[PDB]
Amino acid sequence: KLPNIVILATGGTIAGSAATGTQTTGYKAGALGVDTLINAVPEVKKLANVKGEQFSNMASENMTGDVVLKLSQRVNELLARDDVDGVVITHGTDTVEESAYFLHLTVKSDKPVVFVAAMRPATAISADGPMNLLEAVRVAGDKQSRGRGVMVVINDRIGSARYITKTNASTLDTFRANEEGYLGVIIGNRIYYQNRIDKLHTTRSVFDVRGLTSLPKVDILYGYQDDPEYLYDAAIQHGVKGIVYAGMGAGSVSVRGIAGMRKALEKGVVVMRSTRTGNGIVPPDEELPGLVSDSLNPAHARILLMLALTRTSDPKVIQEYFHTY
Amino acid sequence: KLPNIVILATGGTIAGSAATGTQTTGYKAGALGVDTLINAVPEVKKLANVKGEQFSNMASENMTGDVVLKLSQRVNELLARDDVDGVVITHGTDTVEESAYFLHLTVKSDKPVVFVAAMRPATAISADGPMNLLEAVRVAGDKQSRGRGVMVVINDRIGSARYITKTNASTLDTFRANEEGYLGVIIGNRIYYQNRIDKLHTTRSVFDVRGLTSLPKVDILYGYQDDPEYLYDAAIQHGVKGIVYAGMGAGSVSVRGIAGMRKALEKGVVVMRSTRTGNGIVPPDEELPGLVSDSLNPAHARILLMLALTRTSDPKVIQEYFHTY
Amino acid sequence: KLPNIVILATGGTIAGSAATGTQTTGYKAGALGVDTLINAVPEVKKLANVKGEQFSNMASENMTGDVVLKLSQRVNELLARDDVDGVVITHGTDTVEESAYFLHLTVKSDKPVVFVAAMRPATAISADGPMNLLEAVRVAGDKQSRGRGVMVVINDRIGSARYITKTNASTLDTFRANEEGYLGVIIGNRIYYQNRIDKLHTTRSVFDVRGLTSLPKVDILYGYQDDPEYLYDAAIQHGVKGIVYAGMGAGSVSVRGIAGMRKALEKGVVVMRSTRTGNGIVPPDEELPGLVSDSLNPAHARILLMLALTRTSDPKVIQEYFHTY
Amino acid sequence: KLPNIVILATGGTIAGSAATGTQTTGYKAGALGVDTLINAVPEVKKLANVKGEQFSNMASENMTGDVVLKLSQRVNELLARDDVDGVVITHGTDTVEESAYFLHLTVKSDKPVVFVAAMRPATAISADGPMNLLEAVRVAGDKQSRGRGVMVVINDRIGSARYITKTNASTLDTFRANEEGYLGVIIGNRIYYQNRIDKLHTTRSVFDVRGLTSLPKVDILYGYQDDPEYLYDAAIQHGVKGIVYAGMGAGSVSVRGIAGMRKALEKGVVVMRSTRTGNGIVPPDEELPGLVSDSLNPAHARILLMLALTRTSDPKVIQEYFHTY
């Protein structure tokens, strides 16, 4: 029989629309309901028994920790039922790497959780959303997909929430993991799996959102020539618990940045040095302040740091998380 | 006869050293002098008549607008003489894209200006520095190289200062221009040119640094879920003339970021929306505040914005610059 | 007023169809007529005055030199008229790099010649064909596009016929030029040009097809472990004028391949060593037999070799062509 | 205590040399002995107890199935001993993907088998071989490396024999797996593992070389415009058991190629359709003759087809191998 898939809608461009079919920019995201989306691709109903639920309807640049936290709890609830085999979450592309990674760390189930997005509005000529959604359901309902961590499906590719990121401001093929590749690809309606991530996630994660009602405050500061120190003062003075530094090269700091970090440290703020480059490993360096983000980019590093702080503030333990998650 | 090339040293990993040949991280950058570098690769002296000049010796994360401005003026002086055919600038990798792009816009000569860097210390096993320097001089002395804008040479590739960027925190092949490719490659001691950038630069640029002693203050703020508004207040309150926003997706802003931008606007601060993604075009959008950066990434966009402000503050003219430079 | 664009159809997947909207493989290419294509995207008629002409209707794997030669002559005729500003050629994806490069070398006009293809059948959910065609016409009608050589437009990118190639058997984003990047991109209905190829083409090419009725015979042989020598004998014995060798690494040959090449040489067959790798430069090597293909891949190298032979058989002159075209 | 690593040398550029340090092309591969290599990087002796064995000394374009078969048997012997923890095989770059994949399928051990190569001669300025060898030994001796299949280590990257391939004729960063990424990377002397391939290999493979003295004959034929049919006749007439077809796009065949394949089929020859593109999935198509290679490229597909024929000639079983290995 067909598997039972629930399609949780949060908004995004995949549900956006513009006045004309040639308008691919300046459209309104989160304008259509989940059912309109489902009826656009009726074929979806032959791959599984789908049920659409409207969790929200916004542009992903406005997604917040509060909402992501509730989204995570809602998905844990659904996955606990016996009449739910998998979940597909329609989301915006802009911050899908952030929400997808948060759930990658907090969903306590082996059942597939697949995020799907689209770079073109649903009203666009050659809109990518329909096929993306169709592929997402297919992946969600396949039993080969269990235990692979949270996945992002778009443009025939299946990426891990831990490595996948939006690398181009506006192309269809924007989502890639340059050094880590894709978990698999969907060609001709067959799924081809190629990798399994060698990291901890989902059912083997220590992070638990059941019981939380708010998350620690973590900001991201950029590293560049002449980077100001006052931005660190500002962050501290506003009660941030952690600071993710999108540094030059391999988390390199200027004299001004070092001053700001030392200050944040003597104030109890956790400093996580990452990179602005876009890919790669930020290796340990005792000569420099703060922890290092391993291969986590700024956006992902902020997510893992927020969660880590809901467990400990021990630098030694947090550094461990960053090398295993 | 051999061409006359001047090698201006500013420091960087290409002049760094560590206690052991297997230490590739945690070393000391800007530790060796230009002459030590020149003598390490004597072959260089058969490709041209070289003269080394020590401009500075620092880790590039500490390079500042002041030093870059003087560097730019120094290179204009040298290129004005008849006994100088080209210049090779040894620089750190971390902010080479910023310094190289600054000179790309302010050097008033058709003569080759080549930046060279290295990802491994000079004391490392398989240090890339020697061959990079050799290739740099070769490119600088070739007459085919005139009029191509400022170039960055490393790992057998020749990249435009306008497109090239450091994409990986720590690999040798870190420098790439995903959508724009390389101007050319150096294989087997022959130079293969393949592209000419379709942008304005050097001798056809309107920016002039002769006469300036300081640059406008421009900061970069990051875009992410829950991004704070107070960082905008902080920047404004510290007298920044412009703000480069490394936005989500195609320069998308959250409600908090929009508030902060509007505020900066009513305070006379120029707002330039760019992208944190790493590649791509941030297209115009009248629904949103600020200008758009075309394909300029945050680091490059800050450099062009600083220079534009030394000429005008007209949003219409600055937006033009961003589409032509 | 609107520019006059002619849309020459040759078949391909962009004109293919399958029984269901979810069938993306095993469909029938070259099934729809140019007018069906034009009417699918009416918006096209607001960008220019279009006239469709049905040149052929086949799957591109069956395109041959004869048909490409006639196609080239047909386009030269059309571009010679005053009421034609540009031409858009719908073609299959499989051998578009070969046909596009052939015309890149033989069309004697500065007017835009744009090839457009599609990876999904026209009857597919999220078919890429409509938007590709729309973008193609836009590029063809823009005056900024003159003198850039033949272009291939697909998936929002504009690639040079000389560098572009199909790198993936079946993804939408299959067309790339890893080392050379794209000439430009089309985002939000604006065209962003970034490069100009530094090679000879179109109006500055020495190759002329007016008057030819057939082309020299050139085959491609692969290089691998245990590659046989008898395939060279076979090719020679079948009257080939040239042999493009898709070699291991930088055009490396095994003892068996060297025997076969020497044999072909003493038989008057021109041997062009290329690479099977996919990208890069095959540098000169006097220790080995045959000419080297510069950065031309096997498919492109065969096209330039066929044309070169319609002019000379001088190894010295052909090698020159390969470094300038 | 230190692990016991054996370094089997087969030749290659990593052991090559040229008259000058600036000569990176036209050098002599397989010119130095394993001990010269070992003494060049003495640091290697602090990472493990190494023993060099000279299996051969040739340029990899001349490596053959016979030799690869013996190499595979020799490695199985060594890995069976208790005083051997891992093996590092120095090999040429040109056909390392072929030898590495052959062993990936026939080595019956969980112990690390690491292939290392180099793009620059050992006598070159900035030769990459030393650091590559150092990294290879480190990976071989780390216990985290067991059970990962055969690996190729070069340029700080660790790639799976199944996905890794040489993508550029002559750059240092030539080895990549565009869609599959790397198994891990080596930065700052620490190994960072990120993926585990989701394919069968080594101890879970059905292919056994113990007892074989020769391998089935398999050739590769290229697909392109005007591809001749006589090449198929030639292959058949020379007793090939299988034919790997490097086809256009997704294994597409011309009418001539179809004629040749049908002929090969009625003669008992197994036809495996692959792609010339360089990456991707060749999906099943009942409308076309022969089997499909999944994501295996021509070079890898030939290796798996040779081995498959040493077990069966059943099309249904061989097609299964191609989807699981």
Curated annotation (Swiss-Prot), chains A, B, C, D:
Keywords: Hydrolase, Pharmaceutical, Signal. The active site is at T13. The keyword Hydrolase applies. Substrate binds at S60, T93, D94. Its EC number is 3.5.1.1. It is an enzyme of class 3 (hydrolase). It catalyses: L-asparagine + H2O = L-aspartate + NH4(+). The keyword Signal applies. One of its GO terms (molecular function) is asparaginase activity. InterPro entries: AsnASE_II, Asp/glu_Ase-like_sf, Asparaginase/glutaminase-like, Asparaginase/glutaminase_AS1, Asparaginase/glutaminase_AS2, Asparaginase_C, L-asparaginase_C, L-asparaginase_N. SMART domains: Asparaginase. Pfam families: Asparaginase, Asparaginase_C. GO terms for biological process: asparagine metabolic process. CDD domains: L-asparaginase_like. Residues 3-325 form the Asparaginase/glutaminase domain. Homotetramer. Belongs to the asparaginase 1 family. The sequence of strain NCPPB 1066 is shown. This is L-asparaginase.
